[PDB]
Amino acid sequence: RKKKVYTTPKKIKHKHKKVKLAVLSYYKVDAEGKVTKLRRECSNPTCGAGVFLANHKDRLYCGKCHSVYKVNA
Amino acid sequence: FGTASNIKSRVNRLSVLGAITSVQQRLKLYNKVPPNGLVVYCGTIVTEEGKEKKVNIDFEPFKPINTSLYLCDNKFHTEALTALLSDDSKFGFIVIDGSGALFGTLQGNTREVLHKFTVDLPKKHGRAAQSALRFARLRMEKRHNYVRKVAETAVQLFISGDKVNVAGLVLAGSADFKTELSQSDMFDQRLQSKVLKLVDISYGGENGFNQAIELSTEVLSNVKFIQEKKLIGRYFDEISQDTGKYCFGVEDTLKALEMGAVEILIVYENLDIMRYVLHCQGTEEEKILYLTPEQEKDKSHFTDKETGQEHELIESMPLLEWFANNYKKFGATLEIVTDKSQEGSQFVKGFGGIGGILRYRVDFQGMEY
Amino acid sequence: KKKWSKKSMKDRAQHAVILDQEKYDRILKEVPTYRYVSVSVLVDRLKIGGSLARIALRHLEKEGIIKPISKHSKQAIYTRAT
RNA sequence: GACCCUUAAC
RNA sequence: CGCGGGGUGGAGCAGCCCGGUAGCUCGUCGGGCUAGGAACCCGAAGGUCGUCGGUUCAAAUCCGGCCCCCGCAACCA
RNA sequence: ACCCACUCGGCACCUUACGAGAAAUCAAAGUCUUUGGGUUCUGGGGGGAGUAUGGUCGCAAGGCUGAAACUUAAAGGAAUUGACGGAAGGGCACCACCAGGAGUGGAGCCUGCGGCUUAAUUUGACUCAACACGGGGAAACUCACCAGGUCCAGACACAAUAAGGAUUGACAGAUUGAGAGCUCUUUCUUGAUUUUGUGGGUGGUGGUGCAUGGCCGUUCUUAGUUGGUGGAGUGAUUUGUCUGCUUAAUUGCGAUAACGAACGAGACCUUAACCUACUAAAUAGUGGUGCUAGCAUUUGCUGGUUAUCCACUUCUUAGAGGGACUAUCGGUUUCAAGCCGAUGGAAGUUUGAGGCAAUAACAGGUCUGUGAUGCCCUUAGACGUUCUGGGCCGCACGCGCGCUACACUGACGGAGCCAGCGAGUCUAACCUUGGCCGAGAGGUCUUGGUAAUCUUGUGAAACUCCGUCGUGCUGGGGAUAGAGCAUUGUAAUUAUUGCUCUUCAACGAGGAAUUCCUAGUAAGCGCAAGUCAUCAGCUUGCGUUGAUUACGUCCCUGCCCUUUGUACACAC
């Protein structure tokens, strides 16, 4: 037995419990009218028609596309 | 190696045979025994969290050593090294005889011979009438010459930088040749006032050095017994003055230490005040605290008030370790103290074991709640 | 440091290997009176080179003065006809 | 002819 | 405070019928013996000879200084 | 003076004998718990200690008398069994010697061990009975050791944010090589393992082989071990199991308080090789097919389409009466089992060799083979599970097992060519056969046998006509460097391995010491297999060429048996 100092920082990082935030899915307030779909997806037939195009700022994120998503307007 | 080859237990056998071999090779690394000796240790130290290594520690002591030791045991034996570390007082021995003089130094254990010389004495017999007294006074004058030469040689080997380093001077000899040396005027005033005792030895030279140590074994220890009473004596005399510089309790006397003054700080050999280094993670705040000997083994206060978070036990450092980092700021002498003496016994049992002298009479209770 | 050697002396052998007229006609006049003639016999008596001994032996059998009896390699056994 | 010794270490 | 010797490996001795640029023993180290110690066997290392200055025929032995080990004389009024 | 028979007295003399004794043993040491003939002296656990404060005798040396303190759990007697003996008598063994042989130790190198690098050099094994052993070459895993985000399979309480949706798969960012973001100013297609005080866990080449199983290592590499019944002794035990006779044998012959048995030895099992008849295919010479390459028109020396075969089997192939049992004989021994010689037969001290191989034992080794097994501040940051990079693949040194040499009986160049074990193919490219020009290596193609006809009629190293240097640190030199060429390997830089080129490096019958060896053995030589991703200086098997004594001894270190001494008892 010589020593054990644990130079790497204190990394007891057990997973969180998913602390609840406020209610979500604020699509719109559309009473007595046509109900459309949000996050319109690509023309590729392999899209599951249930995923969300996370397009924040000129960058598009799609769950169905594993690593590549490139389209031109 | 052979006697260890028939240890019944394999775990003991292999360890001892390997330990002996590793000692052998490190001794093979040394061509000769260095001065101050060579202290060797082999084994397997035990820390926490399981990362094994076999250690091999040989070093030359900073101070000369006299003890010899070889012990194979389930634990390391450092008691000789601790004693050689604690005992630092040096006592000079002067062995004066008509045949010659010797000067020696005595640490806690080791015995060194600084400088010894022989002298041809004249003939006591004068067997004259019209010149007996002239030769008798002449013979006395040569004795004075030898007394002074021994006296001046004492200053050269013991006094260094206009300060005496040896704790005390033991003047050993026979046939009244040490009484005159101690009472001689040419003998240094500081060294004469440091004369410990006169010892009647049956032999001169190195043999008288051995016998002088044997007859002065208890007195050398009693020197620290004497300086111990003197250190606290000025502390208690200032108490008997009924003056305003009275303090008690570690909680207060440490505040006095942090304020200033404190000519001398008194620290016990076996401190009862164990302190834990604390460090909070959240607020990023660092502070200093103090603890009591009796309210730390079992108390329901061991929780977090500032943040209310659990704290794992941290390795604890002594107060002497922290105070030794900056013990020179106050200039106070680090003196290990005892509790044997009755006056000291009530000081420990009534006054907290820490005291100091203030430069002037200043009020503490004036600013209090 | 010790190297555990003996390092004996040497005789400084001087086996000549390119032969001149003095050696050429010496061996020619001395190949008689030699009951047994071989490669080692030539070099240990006329102090010629090892290759000269076998080459000269081939010369003495080409013209023919010394009559070989055993033509084995590593050991040449030639006698002289009488 | 010569031939001494043998663990504290479960 | 005179007169004499001596100083060569860790230790003891070889250059004293004026010169082998230093050798022989113990000790130490390595190997082998033996089931390890010892004893034994086989090998190896170790000092430019107290220091400084003088003839320059391998000179430092033998010369002159200081230090060290010692030894004898230290009397008659 | 002898001989017989008495007798008294004496020195003695033959027994685990009625009796006595703890036994040894005892003609008294008996007549003694069935205790008494007379009488003197002495002892009461060991030591201190026959040690005087004393006394007495003595010239003295010393004699006689003679404690205590204190300290001990034993000391001691006689046997038994074993172990041991620089004790004796026998018998043995080349892990012993003798006559020797080849050597090792000496050189370089390859392996395996023994401290240290405040970073690991994983580890067990310390005489035989470890140290080319762990079947232990490591591109990397194997792997344990080190540096490194660190993902985990609750069995029957649920102490609750359990639809306040308890939860996974993923962009990148100083820090994750990556179609391995675990949460992280941005959380998206199926979704009901819930998360930590905390009392059962499913793993670990973590430690304990002084907790164990099993397996393997000293003697049985050599003849030991043990019941039943009977005998002896109080008993531990002993006899059987033993004098002599021979033992590569507690093997037998045999005296015999033993008889009858069991285990071990032997016997048993495996090889070489003559049965020539229900052991062979053209998987081997074939006895006659068909003709070609030389001479004699007279009589050889080799190649062969593929289901006509013909009185087919003696060589590597191994069943059924087989065979070799000391034949017989010669001699030596109570002619008893049996040493030794003479023709004999594939072979003769049981034919050679090996396997199997008893009863106790060892704190022998192995927890690192095992999913064979209790403990380890163990069950969501770990020793578990892996992924990347490092490393017994590191050097002042010492030791063990080894390889190649120090050369003319030898090196090199031709050339001639000759064995035997044996292996080789599914989620197959292993066994390099020929037509890959290619040219050490391996990509093209695989025409290839339930592996004699394919590697391989093993077609090899060693060896052996003839020639190159001649005795030198020389052609005995890649030992050590540099430069380049190749294939196995998601990857070799601390040469993976093979190939071509430069220089001599130590080394010149190696000190003390030491090992193995009795026949086709030793020794020289090389090949297949294990390991293996090509290529291993090791092992296992083997096969080629083939040495001096074998009437041996115990002194040469150890075994076996017996007798004897012991104050030893895990036992010199």
UniProtKB/Swiss-Prot annotation, chain A:
The modification Phosphoserine is found at residue 43. It comes from the Eukaryota. Component of the small ribosomal subunit (SSU). Mature yeast ribosomes consist of a small (40S) and a large (60S) subunit. The 40S small subunit contains 1 molecule of ribosomal RNA (18S rRNA) and 33 different proteins (encoded by 57 genes). The large 60S subunit contains 3 rRNA molecules (25S, 5.8S and 5S rRNA) and 46 different proteins (encoded by 81 genes). The gene is RPS31. The chain holds residues 80 to 152 of 152 of the full protein. It is found in: Cytoplasm. A zinc finger (C4-type) spans 42-65. This is Small ribosomal subunit protein eS31. There is a cross-link at residues 28, 34 (Glycyl lysine isopeptide (Lys-Gly) (interchain with G-Cter in ubiquitin)). Component of the ribosome, a large ribonucleoprotein complex responsible for the synthesis of proteins in the cell. The small ribosomal subunit (SSU) binds messenger RNAs (mRNAs) and translates the encoded message by selecting cognate aminoacyl-transfer RNA (tRNA) molecules. The large subunit (LSU) contains the ribosomal catalytic site termed the peptidyl transferase center (PTC), which catalyzes the formation of peptide bonds, thereby polymerizing the amino acids delivered by tRNAs into a polypeptide chain.
UniProtKB/Swiss-Prot annotation, chain B:
One of its GO terms (molecular function) is translation release factor activity. The modification Phosphothreonine is found at residue 292. Its main location: cytoplasm. One of its GO terms (cellular component) is cytoplasm. It is found in: Cytoplasm. The keyword Cytoplasm applies. The modification N5-methylglutamine is found at residue 130. Methylated at Gln-130 by N6AMT1. One of its GO terms (biological process) is cytoplasmic translational termination. There is a cross-link at residues 32, 349 (Glycyl lysine isopeptide (Lys-Gly) (interchain with G-Cter in SUMO2)). Keywords: Acetylation, Cytoplasm, Hydroxylation, Isopeptide bond, Methylation, Nonsense-mediated mRNA decay, Phosphoprotein, Protein biosynthesis, Ubl conjugation. A motif (NIKS motif) lies at residues 6-9. The keyword Transcription regulation does not apply. Disulfide bonds: none annotated. The modification 4-hydroxylysine is found at residue 8. There is a cross-link at residue 224 (Glycyl lysine isopeptide (Lys-Gly) (interchain with G-Cter in ubiquitin)). Belongs to the eukaryotic release factor 1 family. Component of the eRF1-eRF3-GTP ternary complex, a ternary complex that mediates translation termination in response to the termination codons. The eRF1-eRF3-GTP complex binds to a stop codon in the ribosomal A-site. ETF1/ERF1 is responsible for stop codon recognition and inducing hydrolysis of peptidyl-tRNA. Following GTP hydrolysis, eRF3 (GSPT1/ERF3A or GSPT2/ERF3B) dissociates, permitting ETF1/eRF1 to accommodate fully in the A-site and mediate hydrolysis of peptidyl-tRNA. Component of the eRF1-eRF3-GTP ternary complex, composed of ETF1/ERF1 and eRF3 (GSPT1/ERF3A or GSPT2/ERF3B) and GTP. Component of the transient SURF (SMG1-UPF1-eRF1-eRF3) complex. Interacts with JMJD4. The ETF1-GSPT1 complex interacts with JMJD4. This is Eukaryotic peptide chain release factor subunit 1. It comes from Homo sapiens. The chain holds residues 56 to 424 of 437 of the full protein.
Curated annotation (Swiss-Prot), chain C:
Keywords: Cytoplasm, Methylation, Ribonucleoprotein, Ribosomal protein. The keyword Ribonucleoprotein applies. The keyword Cytoplasm applies. One of its GO terms (biological process) is cytoplasmic translation. GO terms for cellular component: cytosol; cytosolic small ribosomal subunit. One of its GO terms (molecular function) is structural constituent of ribosome. It comes from the Eukaryota. Residues 1-7 have a biased composition (Basic residues). It is found in: Cytoplasm. Belongs to the eukaryotic ribosomal protein eS25 family. It is presumed that the precursor part of S25 is engaged in assembling of the small subunit, thus being essential in ribosome maturation. Component of the ribosome, a large ribonucleoprotein complex responsible for the synthesis of proteins in the cell. The small ribosomal subunit (SSU) binds messenger RNAs (mRNAs) and translates the encoded message by selecting cognate aminoacyl-transfer RNA (tRNA) molecules. The large subunit (LSU) contains the ribosomal catalytic site termed the peptidyl transferase center (PTC), which catalyzes the formation of peptide bonds, thereby polymerizing the amino acids delivered by tRNAs into a polypeptide chain. Component of the small ribosomal subunit (SSU). Mature yeast ribosomes consist of a small (40S) and a large (60S) subunit. The 40S small subunit contains 1 molecule of ribosomal RNA (18S rRNA) and 33 different proteins (encoded by 57 genes). The large 60S subunit contains 3 rRNA molecules (25S, 5.8S and 5S rRNA) and 46 different proteins (encoded by 81 genes). This is Small ribosomal subunit protein eS25A.
